[PDB]
Structure formats: structure tokens, C-alpha cells
């Protein structure tokens, strides 16, 4: 599945 899906934030 998806690589680098949440590198810009967690909120």
C-alpha cells in the first residue's frame, strides 16, 4: 500500500 502518505502531518 501507500508510501509517504503522512509525512506532512498527523492532526
Amino acid at each position, epitope marked *: 500500500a501507500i508510501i509517504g502518505l503522512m509525512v*506532512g502531518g498527523v492532526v
Partner: antibody, heavy 116, light 113 residues
Framework: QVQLVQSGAEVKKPGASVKVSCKASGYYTEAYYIHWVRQAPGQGLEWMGRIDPATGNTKYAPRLQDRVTMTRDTSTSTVYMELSSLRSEDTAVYYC?????????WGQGTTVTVSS | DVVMTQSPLSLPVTLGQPASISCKSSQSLLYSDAKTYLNWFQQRPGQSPRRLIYQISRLDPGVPDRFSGSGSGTDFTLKISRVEAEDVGVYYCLQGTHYPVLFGQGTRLEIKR
């Protein structure tokens, strides 16, 4: 890889409501949180909120919480943003964007004009 | 609420000089992993905004080597080693660690003559 396509230019009157859509397409559109951001004339970028398409769960900028809603349609992988009680300082370019992903995938922008 | 303070607001730079932009948060942006969600965005006139950098120092694809990022916790800097005319625009930090997500107020970068 995802691609976001927004609804076109809108002209609305003060006090009214506007609804902007963002059609997602690609593999696993449900795994990307969609954000809305806006830029008024001269003004800085302002973050309006995100929706999780998986669950429909939303978070809003506090300055706007009372006035904006974010909704989803899973059959059509579309997300919607409704801004109520429009005043003229809401005239702006509104983008949807997967701000958390690498790279960020952007909509092309929708222009909203508040005026009689 | 976490508060983001970008500095300076307007940045006139002689062509070919280096430049830096400062972003300070009111609290740390270190999250429960060893990861720090500070991002840097650019908007040039007439264009859509783009992300330049994610996680303090990591370049997005398409971003030239001239842009670099640094800092930790509550204090961040965006460096441009050599300013060209294509760097004219507004630059924003964005904090992705604590609700609510929040852009800095923007730094306008222009060429000085």
C-alpha cells in the same frame, strides 16, 4: 498517485451559503485526508479544516467552526465543503489538497465571490 | 493554541544573495515518534502553492538544491543559498503536529535593486 478535481467558479450573495466539491481519483482515494485551504486577495493562506474520507471525521479551524461543514460521498469519492453566512471577506480562492501526503496533491482552485 | 511566528514579513534580496526565513512555534512540534512535522510552502504570483520541504529538512520532488531547512523543537529556518528571480513570492511555514493545523503569516520575498 491521486488527482483532485474541484467544482467551478461560484458567485453568491452576502448571507448565503456556498458548496465546493473535490472529486478524488486514483488508487486508494480513501487513504488520503483532504484539506481545504483558502487565499483571500492580498491575504495569507488560511487552513480551514480536513476530512478523513475513511470515516467522515472532521477537524476545523476554530475561527470558522461555527460556519463551515465538511462532508464526504464514498460511492463518488467526492468531498464537499460548505461555507455559510458568507461575507465579502470570504471572496477568495479555495483549494483542496492532501497536505499530509508525499507529494501533496492539489486541486486546481475554485474562486468564490461574495456580492450582490 | 499553538502560535506560529514567521520572520521577517518582507524580505528584499539582492539578486544572487543568500536569504533565510525564520519560523518559531509557541511549543515544540516534536510528536510521539522522533518525527517533527514542520513544513515549508511557497506561492509564486499567479500560481498554486507548493510544498518545498517536509519534516524540517526533507526536500519535496521538483525542489532545487538551493532550498534547505533546519532547526528543531520550536525554532526553524528556511535557507535559499542563492536567490533568483524565480524565487519571488510568499513563503509559509505549516505546523502539522498539534491541532489545529496552522500556516505562518507569510514572508514576501522580492528582489532588491
Amino acid at each position: 498517485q491521486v488527482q483532485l478535481v474541484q467544482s467551478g467558479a461560484e458567485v453568491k450573495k452576502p448571507g448565503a451559503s456556498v458548496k465546493v466539491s473535490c472529486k478524488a481519483s486514483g488508487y486508494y482515494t480513501e487513504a488520503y485526508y483532504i484539506h481545504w485551504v483558502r487565499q483571500a486577495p492580498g491575504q495569507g493562506l488560511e487552513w480551514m479544516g480536513r476530512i478523513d474520507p475513511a470515516t467522515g471525521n472532521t477537524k476545523y479551524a476554530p475561527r470558522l467552526q461555527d460556519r463551515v461543514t465538511m462532508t464526504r460521498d464514498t460511492s463518488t469519492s467526492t468531498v464537499y465543503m460548505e461555507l455559510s453566512s458568507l461575507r465579502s471577506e470570504d471572496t477568495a480562492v479555495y483549494y483542496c489538497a492532501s497536505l499530509y501526503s508525499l507529494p501533496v496533491y492539489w486541486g486546481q482552485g475554485t474562486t468564490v465571490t461574495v456580492s450582490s | 493554541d499553538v502560535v506560529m511566528t514567521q520572520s521577517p514579513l518582507s524580505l528584499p534580496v539582492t539578486l544572487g544573495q543568500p536569504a533565510s526565513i525564520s519560523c518559531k512555534s509557541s511549543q515544540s512540534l516534536l510528536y510521539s515518534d522522533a518525527k517533527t512535522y514542520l513544513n515549508w510552502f511557497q506561492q509564486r504570483p499567479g500560481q498554486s502553492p507548493r510544498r518545498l520541504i517536509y519534516q524540517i529538512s526533507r526536500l519535496d520532488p521538483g525542489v532545487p538544491d538551493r532550498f534547505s531547512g533546519s532547526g528543531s523543537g520550536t525554532d526553524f529556518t528556511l535557507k535559499i543559498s542563492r536567490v533568483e528571480a524565480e524565487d519571488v513570492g510568499v513563503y509559509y511555514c505549516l505546523q502539522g503536529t498539534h491541532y489545529p493545523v496552522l500556516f505562518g503569516q507569510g514572508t514576501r520575498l522580492e528582489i532588491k535593486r
